[PDB]
Structures are given as structure tokens and as C-alpha cells.
Amino acid sequence: WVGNESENPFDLALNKKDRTLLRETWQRLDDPKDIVGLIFLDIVNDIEPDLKKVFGVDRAPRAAMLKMPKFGGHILRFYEFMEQLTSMLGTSENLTGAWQLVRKTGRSHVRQGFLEQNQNQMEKNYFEIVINVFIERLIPFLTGEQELNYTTSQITDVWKKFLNTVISQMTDSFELERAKQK
Amino acid sequence: WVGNESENPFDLALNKKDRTLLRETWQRLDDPKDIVGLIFLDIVNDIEPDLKKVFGVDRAPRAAMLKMPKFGGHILRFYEFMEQLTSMLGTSENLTGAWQLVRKTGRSHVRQGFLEQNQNQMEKNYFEIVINVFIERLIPFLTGEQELNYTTSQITDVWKKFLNTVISQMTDSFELERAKQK
Ligand code: HEM
Ligand code: HEM
Structure with a gap:
């Protein structure tokens, strides 16, 4: 993918209001x-x-x-x-740059020998393992349910769609880059 | 991907109401x-x-x-x-089988020599070329705007999200399978 295609999952899974919510909720955080x-x-x-x-x-x-x-x-x-990523999605609507950032980051991880050897969709997906802890731990800060207009259900659902899309695109870009390198 | 993961883009881009619309609008067609x-x-x-x-x-x-x-x-x-695919998504909510079907179909096309040689995200993506004609031609039948509750804008947006997700998953699964085969 170049990045500018209409099939960009950040445009399909998130609409404009969703993306604004992602940015505004992230910005509400003190010391992210x-x-x-x-x-x-x-x-x-x-x-x-x-x-x-x-x-x-x-x-x-x-x-x-x-x-x-x-x-x-x-x-x-x-x-x-x-x-x-949240700025590109929710402030500038630079959906191309957001998708490109995620896939470039996925590809770049192939250089990490631990991941090249162990990243495995059948067994452990380490991008999923990391981001799932964010889903469990970051979202309650974002909703204000935990401490350190939008409903709690809205914020939770949007952040889950967003973070799951980050997992899928890093996973796919990594997998392809590893296959090509052999 | 096994297919049962939470990162399934058909679950992220489409919600339950969207999937029901996909199925009901497809079924409204006479001689699909x-x-x-x-x-x-x-x-x-x-x-x-x-x-x-x-x-x-x-x-x-x-x-x-x-x-x-x-x-x-x-x-x-x-x-x-x-x-x-529309039945799995919109009737049975078999989101795993829907995603698995699309990726399996993408992988299977690597056997088509024309595509193995010519499929190219930099130049021509033939899954995109085909499905884009469906986006332009099938959607007006689905909305009833052309001949052979849900608003026209709703039906159009849902079918675009759906068909774009079919393009992205066939493209990605194809690309990976080709890279692995070498
Ligand atoms: C889960 C989502 C993750 C995100 C968003 C992420 C993000 C990043 C970014 C932005 C960089 C620097 C730019 C680049 O190299 O692309 C980086 C580098 C790196 N990543 Fe990740 N990463 C993730 C997961 C992981 C995992 C699971 C590992 C396990 C090995 C890992 C290991 C590393 C290492 C070793 C570096 C080099 C910099 C350092 O060691 O601090 N990353 N990562
Ligand atoms: C655009 C989305 C497409 C869909 C959903 C689709 C669907 C299918 C399905 C369901 C099959 C049989 C099961 C299988 O082999 O997986 C198939 C086979 C086949 N596909 Fe596609 N296809 C698509 C695009 C293309 C394109 C762009 C080509 C260009 C070469 C192509 C060429 C073929 C050929 C030659 C077969 C063997 C059967 C036949 O020739 O009729 N397909 N396709």
C-alpha cells in the first residue's frame, strides 16, 4: 500500500467524529x-x-x-x-500519513531479532499482547473512570476500534516484511 | 490470522446494524x-x-x-x-468465517498466473479494479436508485465500507501468500 488508498482501515473503522474523540480524549490526559x-x-x-x-x-x-x-x-x-497518530487522525485528518506511520512501524520491527524469531499469529502476537494491556489499562484513564458529550461507552468502543486497527496493521505489515526478507 | 481474533476488520468497520443492512439490501435484489x-x-x-x-x-x-x-x-x-459472505456477516454473525472466507479467497488467487505476475499495489491492484466497478454499479441497484428504514446514504456508506474491507483483506492475504511462495 502506498497509504493514500480508499481501503485505509483507519478511515473505515473510524469516522470523523470518532477520530476527533480519539484526539480530544488523549489530550485530556495529564502526563500521557x-x-x-x-x-x-x-x-x-x-x-x-x-x-x-x-x-x-x-x-x-x-x-x-x-x-x-x-x-x-x-x-x-x-x-x-x-x-x-492521534494528531494525524483527529486533528489534521491526514489519514494517509496515519496509515503509513502504522505500517512503517510494523515493518521496522522486523529488525528486532526477538520478534523476527518469535512473532507468531498461531502462538504469540507481541503487538497484540502489548496493545491489549493498553486496552485494559489506558482506556479507564481515557474515560476518567481511573486517575493518576462523550459517554464512557463511546470512548471505550472508539479506542478499542482504534487500538485493534493498530494491532492488525502492525501485524500485517510486519508479517509481509518478514516474508519478503525471508 | 486464525480468523477468530478481535482485530477482524469486518467487526471493526461494520457494526451489527450495518451487517444486517448488508444482508437485507443484498436479499432485496431480484436476480443478483x-x-x-x-x-x-x-x-x-x-x-x-x-x-x-x-x-x-x-x-x-x-x-x-x-x-x-x-x-x-x-x-x-x-x-x-x-x-x-453477506449471510455470515448479517444473518449468522459468523464474523470468524466471514474473515476466513475473504483471506482464503485472497490466498487462493496466487494460483492464477496472471495475478501472480501482475498484481501490484504500486501499479494495478486487480481486486481493487474489480470491486471498484461493483462500488460504482452494484450500489445503485442496492439503493433502488437503479433497476434491472435505510436511507440511500446509509446503504451507500455501508456497502463502501464492506467492499473496501473485502479489497483490503484479499489484497493483504494475496500479497503475503505470494511473498511466502516467493
Ligand atoms: C505493540 C505496538 C508497538 C508499537 C506501537 C511500537 C512502537 C515502536 C516505535 C515507534 C519504535 C521506534 C521507531 C521504529 O523503530 O519504528 C519502536 C522501536 C522498537 N520496538 Fe517497538 N513498538 C511496539 C511493540 C513492540 C514489541 C512487542 C516489541 C518486542 C520486541 C518492541 C520492540 C522494540 C524495540 C527493541 C525497538 C528499538 C527501540 C528500543 O529498544 O527502545 N516493540 N517501537
Ligand atoms: C475482486 C474480487 C474477487 C473475488 C471476490 C473473486 C472470487 C473468486 C472465487 C470465490 C473463486 C473460486 C474460489 C477460489 O478460487 O478462491 C475465484 C476463482 C478465480 N478467480 Fe477470482 N475473484 C476476484 C477477483 C479476481 C480477479 C481480479 C481475477 C483476475 C485474474 C480473478 C481470477 C480468477 C480465476 C481465473 C479463478 C478460477 C475460476 C475461473 O476462472 O472462473 N479473480 N475467484
């Missing part, structure tokens, strides 16, 4: 990078501890991990990716 | 196979004549094509695919 950090700490410590080694935090106490370079780097990168 | 036939006749004769050779109708007058085996066979297969 801190929330992203807390969720990644849960991912590597509680949910998928195989990821500690990947991020170089297999020895760091939970309390030191945010300072370790690969781990704190990833938190920054993931936060920036969500910042840009 | 005839309409499918007429649209394929336009595709091969007027829009993408490179396809005449593929379907063995490079000599048949337009008036004989429906009887030629590869061409009339394809019309039957495409009609059955839409019949099953």
Missing part, C-alpha cells in the same frame, strides 16, 4: 508519557516477562527500569507514535 | 447473479480488457461470454462468495 511508562512497567513485569530481556531490564528493579535506555527509549517512542 | 454477470461483462469489455484473456473471452462477443466456462464460472463463484 507517565501513563505509557506505567503500562509498559506492567507489561514487562506482570504480563509478558519474556520482554524484560528484550528491553534490557531483566535485572533492573521495577523502580529503575524507566531509566534503562532500551526500555525508557521504547516508552518515549511509543508515546510519540500515539501522539503523532 | 444476473447483476453480477452484467457487472463482470462491463469489467472485461469496458474497464479492464486485459481480463478478457484471463477468462478465456478474448474472442467471444459480449453476448456469448456468460456461457464461456472460466468467465461464467467466475461470475457464479463471485456471486456465491458474496451470498455466503
Whole structure:
């Protein structure tokens, strides 16, 4: 895909009002990078501890991990990716750039040897594992149900459609890029 | 993808009411196979004549094509695919089987040498070329605007989301299967 096609799932799964909600709800958050950090700490410590080694935090106490370079780097990168993606979708309506960003990010992960070897739709999809923790943990902050016009049901459904579309496009772009590289 | 995942784009782009509309509007049609036939006749004769050779109708007058085996066979297969897909989506809510059907069909086309050689997202996407003629020609039958509760705008938007999702999933499944086969 070039990115400008009419089949863009971010245009199909989300309408204009949905995209505005994604941006406005994300912006309502105070310290979104801190929330992203807390969720990644849960991912590597509680949910998928195989990821500690990947991020170089297999020895760091939970309390030191945010300072370790690969781990704190990833938190920054993931936060920036969500910042840009929600802005493109919900502010500029740059639907092409939003789709292109997600597929480029999916393809780029093929360089991660852990994922090249272990990413597997039959067994573990690590993009799904990570984003599912966001679905469970980020959405209650976004609805205001948890702390650190739109109804709770609306915000929940929109963020689920959005985050599931991020999973599917990163998964598909990764899988294709890996197949091509062989 | 197994098919049962939460990232299924037919569940994300279409809600239950949308899927019911897809099924009810398709069922309102009198002789849907005839309409499918007429649209394929336009595709091969007027829009993408490179396809005449593929379907063995490079000599048949337009008036004989429906009887030629590869061409009339394809019309039957495409009609059955839409019949099953709209039933799965809109009647049984078998969203897994709907997604699986579309990806299996995408993968199966890699066996078509014309597509293996020529299918190309940079240049011509033949699934997109075919389905776009359906978007232009089938939707006015579905809305009742042309001849052979839901508003015209609703029916048009739902069928566009649906048919665009069929294009994207056939395209992606095809591309992956071709890359794997090499
Ligand atoms: C789940 C959705 C994910 C998103 C949105 C995401 C986002 C990003 C971004 C934006 C970058 C830098 C730009 C780029 O390389 O494309 C990056 C790099 C990286 N990603 Fe991810 N990532 C995700 C999941 C994962 C997973 C499951 C792994 C497991 C290995 C992973 C490992 C890495 C690593 C090691 C880097 C290099 C930078 C670093 O180590 O901090 N990512 N990721
Ligand atoms: C655009 C969406 C399309 C749909 C939904 C579709 C559907 C189907 C189905 C359901 C079958 C039989 C089952 C299977 O093999 O999976 C089939 C076979 C086939 N498809 Fe397609 N098709 C599409 C596009 C195309 C295109 C663009 C070509 C161009 C080569 C093509 C060429 C063929 C051929 C040659 C067969 C074998 C049967 C025959 O020749 O009649 N199809 N297609």
C-alpha cells in the first residue's frame, strides 16, 4: 500500500467524529508519557516477562527500569507514535500519513531479532499482547473512570476500534516484511 | 490470522446494524447473479480488457461470454462468495468465517498466473479494479436508485465500507501468500 488508498482501515473503522474523540480524549490526559511508562512497567513485569530481556531490564528493579535506555527509549517512542497518530487522525485528518506511520512501524520491527524469531499469529502476537494491556489499562484513564458529550461507552468502543486497527496493521505489515526478507 | 481474533476488520468497520443492512439490501435484489454477470461483462469489455484473456473471452462477443466456462464460472463463484459472505456477516454473525472466507479467497488467487505476475499495489491492484466497478454499479441497484428504514446514504456508506474491507483483506492475504511462495 502506498497509504493514500480508499481501503485505509483507519478511515473505515473510524469516522470523523470518532477520530476527533480519539484526539480530544488523549489530550485530556495529564502526563500521557507517565501513563505509557506505567503500562509498559506492567507489561514487562506482570504480563509478558519474556520482554524484560528484550528491553534490557531483566535485572533492573521495577523502580529503575524507566531509566534503562532500551526500555525508557521504547516508552518515549511509543508515546510519540500515539501522539503523532492521534494528531494525524483527529486533528489534521491526514489519514494517509496515519496509515503509513502504522505500517512503517510494523515493518521496522522486523529488525528486532526477538520478534523476527518469535512473532507468531498461531502462538504469540507481541503487538497484540502489548496493545491489549493498553486496552485494559489506558482506556479507564481515557474515560476518567481511573486517575493518576462523550459517554464512557463511546470512548471505550472508539479506542478499542482504534487500538485493534493498530494491532492488525502492525501485524500485517510486519508479517509481509518478514516474508519478503525471508 | 486464525480468523477468530478481535482485530477482524469486518467487526471493526461494520457494526451489527450495518451487517444486517448488508444482508437485507443484498436479499432485496431480484436476480443478483444476473447483476453480477452484467457487472463482470462491463469489467472485461469496458474497464479492464486485459481480463478478457484471463477468462478465456478474448474472442467471444459480449453476448456469448456468460456461457464461456472460466468467465461464467467466475461470475457464479463471485456471486456465491458474496451470498455466503453477506449471510455470515448479517444473518449468522459468523464474523470468524466471514474473515476466513475473504483471506482464503485472497490466498487462493496466487494460483492464477496472471495475478501472480501482475498484481501490484504500486501499479494495478486487480481486486481493487474489480470491486471498484461493483462500488460504482452494484450500489445503485442496492439503493433502488437503479433497476434491472435505510436511507440511500446509509446503504451507500455501508456497502463502501464492506467492499473496501473485502479489497483490503484479499489484497493483504494475496500479497503475503505470494511473498511466502516467493
Ligand atoms: C505493540 C505496538 C508497538 C508499537 C506501537 C511500537 C512502537 C515502536 C516505535 C515507534 C519504535 C521506534 C521507531 C521504529 O523503530 O519504528 C519502536 C522501536 C522498537 N520496538 Fe517497538 N513498538 C511496539 C511493540 C513492540 C514489541 C512487542 C516489541 C518486542 C520486541 C518492541 C520492540 C522494540 C524495540 C527493541 C525497538 C528499538 C527501540 C528500543 O529498544 O527502545 N516493540 N517501537
Ligand atoms: C475482486 C474480487 C474477487 C473475488 C471476490 C473473486 C472470487 C473468486 C472465487 C470465490 C473463486 C473460486 C474460489 C477460489 O478460487 O478462491 C475465484 C476463482 C478465480 N478467480 Fe477470482 N475473484 C476476484 C477477483 C479476481 C480477479 C481480479 C481475477 C483476475 C485474474 C480473478 C481470477 C480468477 C480465476 C481465473 C479463478 C478460477 C475460476 C475461473 O476462472 O472462473 N479473480 N475467484
